[PDB]
């Protein structure tokens, strides 16, 4: 289906404990493929998926140099942000940034992204036009004016529409046997008595990729959103994901409940019931 390449940058100051750590991780969809960590003994862009390993030394050298420079740029940015908020040198602060591109099934650009947060709060974002910024507050307006003066949006647009999508398409081809393979969930319903009066029905989805899934319970054909406990989709550690949805049902009424599953790997959406 559709695909994305995204880089996730986290920089965290730690006064009294050295300079801020910078870590970058790169993903195609739900698959991490690179990391860089300034706290590594020998910081370097490192492969984290088999299909990226074939890239030549120029790829690793260029990304390592970009990331080493980024460590310094983010440290400067953290110093600037501390000043923009009149903050003390005593406290720890976090600067997060995510950027990258989305393509459709035809490989054509859907949209680009460049968004940042300071201490977990949205700070500045490149708008979908790839030409203007949205600043959260008067501090972020300083960054906006600085990026407007330096024509940063134009540089990001050129990257997002060219380099980013070209590399995403290349990764999708090199890793096609995994990145372009949707693995359906293995599904089943379990039954867990609570009392004489009620039991839990839990609908499981295991072994699926990518993480996007719809997993719901209906009673008599009516969706039970408020009454369903739906856990966050969680990684299994073998590239796949897991999820479950549970409802509390009165004893003897189990057959009024149906679990519904949709996922890209399924030839058809599933309907399941408890099968005692």
């Amino acid at each position: 289906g559709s695909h994305s390449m995204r880089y996730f940058h986290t920089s965290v100051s730690r006064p009294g404990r050295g300079e801020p750590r910078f870590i970058s991780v790169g993903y195609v969809d739900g698959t991490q493929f690179v990391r860089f960590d300034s706290d590594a003994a020998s910081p370097r862009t490192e492969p984290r998926a088999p299909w990226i390993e074939q890239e030549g030394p120029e790829y690793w050298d260029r990304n390592t140099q970009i990331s080493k420079t980024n460590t310094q740029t983010y440290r400067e940015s953290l110093r600037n942000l501390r000043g923009y908020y009149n903050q003390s040198e005593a406290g720890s602060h976090t600067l997060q940034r995510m950027y990258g591109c989305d393509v459709g099934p035809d490989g054509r650009l859907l949209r680009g992204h460049d968004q940042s947060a300071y201490d977990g709060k949205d700070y500045i974002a490149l708008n979908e036009d790839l030409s203007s910024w949205t600043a959260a507050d008067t501090a972020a307006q300083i960054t906006q004016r600085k990026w407007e003066a330096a024509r940063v949006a134009e540089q990001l647009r050129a990257y997002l529409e060219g380099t980013c999508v070209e590399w995403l398409r290349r990764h999708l081809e090199n890793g096609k046997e995994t990145l372009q393979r949707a693995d359906p969930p293995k599904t089943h319903v379990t039954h867990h008595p609570i009392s004489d009066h009620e039991a839990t029905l839990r609908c499981w989805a295991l072994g699926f990729y990518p993480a996007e899934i719809t997993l719901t319970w209906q009673r008599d054909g009516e969706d039970q959103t408020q009454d369903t406990e739906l856990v966050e989709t969680r990684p299994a550690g073998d590239r796949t994901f897991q999820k479950w949805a549970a409802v509390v049902v009165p004893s003897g009424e189990e057959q009024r409940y149906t679990c519904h599953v949709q996922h890209e790997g399924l030839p058809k959406p599933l309907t399941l019931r408890w099968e005692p």
Binding site: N70, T73, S77, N80, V152, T163, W167
Partner: peptide, 8 residues
């Protein structure tokens, strides 16, 4: 490939 970050 990544892009350079821009100073905030």
């Amino acid at each position: 490939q990544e892009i350079r970050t821009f100073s905030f």
